[PDB]
């Protein structure tokens, strides 16, 4: 029938005719986006020997530096690791164009004051987080090193 | 076909075949290959009023771009945020339709415009509708122009 359609005549003369073109079709589609986060030593920031006091917290911008929370999940050494907006694997995979990191030392009870829309002594004058926050807050007990 | 709808004078430009606009993307879409005439006349005298009725409405948010000559009447809240709207307005949830706001002394650019879209099948279709074209006695067996 393909031969009849190419000829445009129902009757087909004896012979060999190319009436179609065959191309292998992809089983699946693979999609990779242009890398935007960049690279850095993410582990070193966690391993830093000293952290700034809460009243004057140091600010380091995570820009042009890798975003990797897979190691953080494996370590499991953080007393509180809340995540916001999306599931933890989903944020880990997504590239982040600009991230902001704030480093400070507070008591475990004091950490609650540093939370979105949270009012406390540490939340009113030490530092403050906006009510709508998509960022993930990481807190780990430092009694072994900080306490003396 | 007569299509009656409400749009601002600047918005009328957005509703054109081969033209991309916020109005074209969500509330109403005009086909790129569509054949016809779109007629717009200022309705500032009648549609705009001291009352400023909000009966006219347009779709601010749509999940997908409208297909050409397709109508969406859904009032379900758009789930822009990860949190579900649950069928009610919520933080990070925006109503799909925004009520039109019009002013009696609105400027010509901001004047409400009544817009009618006409589509014609034309050739290859029995002529149910005809131009006045006063008919002239048919002539046969001679070479003559025929319509």
């Amino acid at each position, epitope marked *: 029938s393909e031969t009849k359609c190419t000829l445009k005549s129902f009757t087909v003369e004896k012979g060999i005719y190319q009436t179609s073109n065959f191309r292998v079709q992809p089983t699946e589609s693979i999609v990779r986006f242009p890398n935007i986060t960049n690279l850095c030593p993410f582990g070193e920031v966690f391993n830093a020997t000293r952290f700034a006091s809460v009243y004057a917290w140091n600010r380091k911008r995570i820009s042009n530096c890798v975003a990797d929370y897979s190691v953080l*999940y494996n370590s*499991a*050494s*953080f*007393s*509180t*690791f*809340k*995540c*916001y*907006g*999306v*599931s*933890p*694997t989903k944020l880990n995979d997504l590239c982040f164009t600009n991230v902001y990191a704030d480093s400070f030392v507070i008591r*475990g*009870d004091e*950490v*609650r004051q540093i*939370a*979105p*829309g*949270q009012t406390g002594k540490i939340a009113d004058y030490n530092y403050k987080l906006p*009510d709508d*926050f998509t960022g993930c807050v990481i*807190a780990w*007990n430092s009694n072994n090193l900080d306490s003396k | 076909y007569a299509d009656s709808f409400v749009i601002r004078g600047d918005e009328v430009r957005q509703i054109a075949p081969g033209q991309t606009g916020k109005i074209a993307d969500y509330n109403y879409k005009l086909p790129d290959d569509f054949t016809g005439c779109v007629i717009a006349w200022n309705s500032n005298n009648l549609d705009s009023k001291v009352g400023g009725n909000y009966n006219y409405l347009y779709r601010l948010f749509r999940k997908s771009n409208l297909k050409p000559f397709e109508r969406d009447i859904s009032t379900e809240i758009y789930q822009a945020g*990860s*949190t*579900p709207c649950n069928g009610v307005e*919520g933080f990070n949830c925006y109503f799909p339709l925004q009520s039109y706001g019009f002013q009696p002394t609105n400027g010509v650019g901001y004047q409400p415009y009544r817009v009618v879209v006409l589509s014609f099948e034309l050739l290859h279709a029995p002529a149910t509708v005809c131009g006045p074209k006063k008919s002239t006695n048919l002539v046969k067996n001679k070479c003559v122009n025929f319509n």
Partner: antibody
Amino acid sequence: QLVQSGAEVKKPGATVKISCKVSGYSFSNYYIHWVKQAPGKSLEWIGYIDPFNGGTSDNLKFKGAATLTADTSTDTAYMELSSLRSEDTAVYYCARSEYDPYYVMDYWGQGTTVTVSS
Amino acid sequence: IVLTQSPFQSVSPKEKVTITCRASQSISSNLHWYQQKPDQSPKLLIKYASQSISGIPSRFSGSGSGTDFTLTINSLEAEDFGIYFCQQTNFWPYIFGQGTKLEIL
């Protein structure tokens, strides 16, 4: 006291959402913990949700696609289960939590089974 | 942070029966313990492994050194035993141990 939905059953690859209203205390004051116990098996902490601000913290030992949404006004904690699996066929319990790192859980929901069937 | 406290129990009642929280090499001063009943939403018994919350008869104490903790159920009868789960709070995934299905003569 906490109150969950009734016992439920669903097919694989569907999307399901369960609930747990809070009574006798402010929703913001106490955190909500979601714990899944497989029948005749150890308790597993699927995720913990912060009530005042919506939070999505989940255990990385297994992924159940457990999206967590919290609204302070509703006073109800919502857990969403998708891609149902044999592990997902377990009793699910909401739980009263401290608003602090101690995270003791002592007040619960009735416990709801989410059975997975062909 | 894996816990492996006590498979189950089989002992005459009324005795000082210990269940031995086998903690992971990482140590955490904080813990909890909960009592489970068949198809009953369990309830935390031992808060912080040393303090008592309101509403617990003192039949089962929680005494532990460092990572290891023991919930010595003192003079337990055939009225109380069910399952008893341990809880660990220091490590991010707050894992629960296999737990002890207490059984008795």
